[model samples]
Target: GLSDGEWQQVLNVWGKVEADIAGHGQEVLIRLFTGHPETLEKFDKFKHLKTEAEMKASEDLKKHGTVVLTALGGILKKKGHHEAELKPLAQSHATKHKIPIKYLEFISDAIIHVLHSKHPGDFGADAQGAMTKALELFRNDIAAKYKELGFQ
Candidate 1:
């Protein structure tokens, strides 16, 4: 788990992007989920990316777009995977809205492959499994905090 200070930093970054999405000026969702049935599919905590530069240039409404996806939400499906799906909606909207997406790719393909390489139910199947699990737990924990913040 992240320290309160570290989590504060994440919240700061998250708040800006989320505000944009809330305004519909930003589209696309990022999910972060656990592999369990209860929470197995997430892409990111926010929908768009907001660097310091983006913040300075962002308008009033768009400033809150920093955390586009918010915590506790699941990716109903991978965005941009098919034209008829949520994934596509997410991807297409990203382009239309000029929202930046820094998804699983930021973590890299190799890391994903490594996580999938391990045997199921055996988180210790590989070293990365532990890391993935940690991410999952972090995700879940963050969601809990969001609930406290009044988001369902």
Candidate 2:
């Protein structure tokens, strides 16, 4: 059984994939990509656009994010983004990433849960909200290119 998210994703673009497999009794060709469904869509868009950055994004997804995270953490620690009312924010992000604290996907899920729980529509990094929002934004950017490539 596919997760609701997975089914929703397949339906979002290639619901036809399921339908084709069922109706034609034919094998489907799927190109595998990395990360979650949402993440891959972004990469697909970039590829569609023929953007070099998008081309590299598939390989660089986690690496780029982690690199930026580590680098930003270092810089914020150094330049005092925390001191400028950002320490709390940095700590929030860090604590969310820990296993004992927020869980693995905490930044994207639990974080959002908190914000929505508190403010309802605050729509910021209460938990995983920020991360999810960022992922979707990346996806939208990829959407532009995917459109360029004539992919549905």
Candidate 3:
């Protein structure tokens, strides 16, 4: 469903963040955990890490941030075949994590916001649009999987 130029834009934009994945990933999770304090409840491990500094320094949090980007990285790398790649993530989050689709929305927004803030000069509207499109695909695919898996 994505065009070549859009895929290129996604790759280009992703490459910038991927260069220093830890830094961007940390900032993203930190911002999200801080901004949406409620989201921390999604992770039993993170629920105890309330403060921004605690969440920022948490190895668990950092690992989760990296894990999130890693999933998106696969989606970007695959370019066209994303549903197959997203199945495990969808199943894990749905059946195990019990993460709702709305949380995915927040995660995507947080990722986009963090990337834009980190590279204001590079992450233009077009690049953001590409990310948005990719996330939309992820949401749709994951939602379908959630249903197929019989997750309420």
Candidate 4:
């Protein structure tokens, strides 16, 4: 539900990080785990990592982080109009992974945190606002998919 101008801003900021997608993605996951340790328990591969050092050194975590960001990048590239792509992801998380929709908000927050840290100058108030709205829309779409899958 981002305005065209807002979408442009979001994409513009995304372009800044696109070159280092894997690095940014890994940092976002690291931030997420650091801020919400309980969320880490949801990940079978990461649950056993006892400390930040272990997480930083995890190959599985690195691969999954890249996957996560790559998916987000795909959605963003479509300007948030990729329901066909998102539905299956939502279903898999709901039915197979059993991940709660609320966790999406945590990931969204972690994404913004990484963006802000990486580009404090570029991610000014306006950019942050647009990014927040974009991610909120993304989360809402996923939540809708979860609902359709009979998840609360």
RMSD to native, candidate 3: 1.4
State each model's C-alpha RMSD to the native.
15.9, 18.7, 1.4, 1.1
lDDT, candidate 3, 59-85, per-residue tens: 777787788788779877888687678
Per-candidate Cα lDDT values, in order, are 0.32, 0.32, 0.83, 0.87
User: Candidate 2 vs candidate 4: which has greater TM-score?
Assistant: 4
Best by TM-score: 4
TM-score between model 2 and native: 0.22
| Candidate 2 residue-wise lDDT, 27-97, digit = tens | 11011122223333433333352333453444344343444344333332232222333333334333432
Q: Looking at model 4, how many pairs of residues clash?
A: 0
Worst 10 residues of 4 by lDDT: 16-25
Q: Residue 26 in model 3: shift from native, Å? A: 1.6
lDDT of 1 at 95: 43
Number of the top lDDT candidate: 4
Residue ranges of candidate 2 with Cα displaced over 4 Å: 1-125
Query: For residues 1-152, could you state the per-residue lDDT of candidate 4 as single tens digits?
Result: 78899999989988876888878888999999999998898888889999899988988888888899888888887888888878888888899888888888999999999998888777888889999998898889989888888886
Q: Ten consecutive residues with minimal summed lDDT in candidate 3?
A: 55-64
Cα error of candidate 1 at position 111, Å: 16
